[PDB]
A = this chain, B = another copy of it.
Amino acid sequence: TRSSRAGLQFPVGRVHRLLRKGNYAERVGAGAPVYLAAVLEYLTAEILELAGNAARDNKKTRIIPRHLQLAVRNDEELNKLLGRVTIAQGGVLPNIQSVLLPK
């Protein structure tokens, strides 16, 4: 196996397959799918880590879309990456503006 050869969980083979079939270029150098799989596993790790931490915060045995939305919107960088993304069953962050609250 190649992900073995690279220490990856994500399927280097299937990433190479998708890069080939996706017509992204005439040729896809063998280093490219390894690198992309690694990036796609550092991402995903990032967010699944934050979602599991949120699940601990929310005292849950399972990540539910709430936890993903919370993780994504609390992390300023993921919220930059995903600002034009919406997530099923995610809801929204607590947002009340100062003039709406009573003095």
Contact = CB atoms under 8 A, between A and B. Distances in A.
Contacts of A26: 23
**Shortest 4 CB-CB contacts between residues of A and residues of B:** A23-B23, A23-B25, A23-B26, A23-B24
Nearest to A24: B23
Contacts of A23: 23-26
Interface string A25-59: 11000000000000000000000000000000000
Chain A residues touching B, range: under 10
| Residue from A23, A24, A25, A26 having most chain B Cβ neighbours under 10 A | A23
Interface in A1-40: 23-26
A93 to B, nearest CB: 28
A41 to B, nearest CB: 26
Nearest to A23: B23
Contacts of A25: 23
A25 B24 CA distance: 9
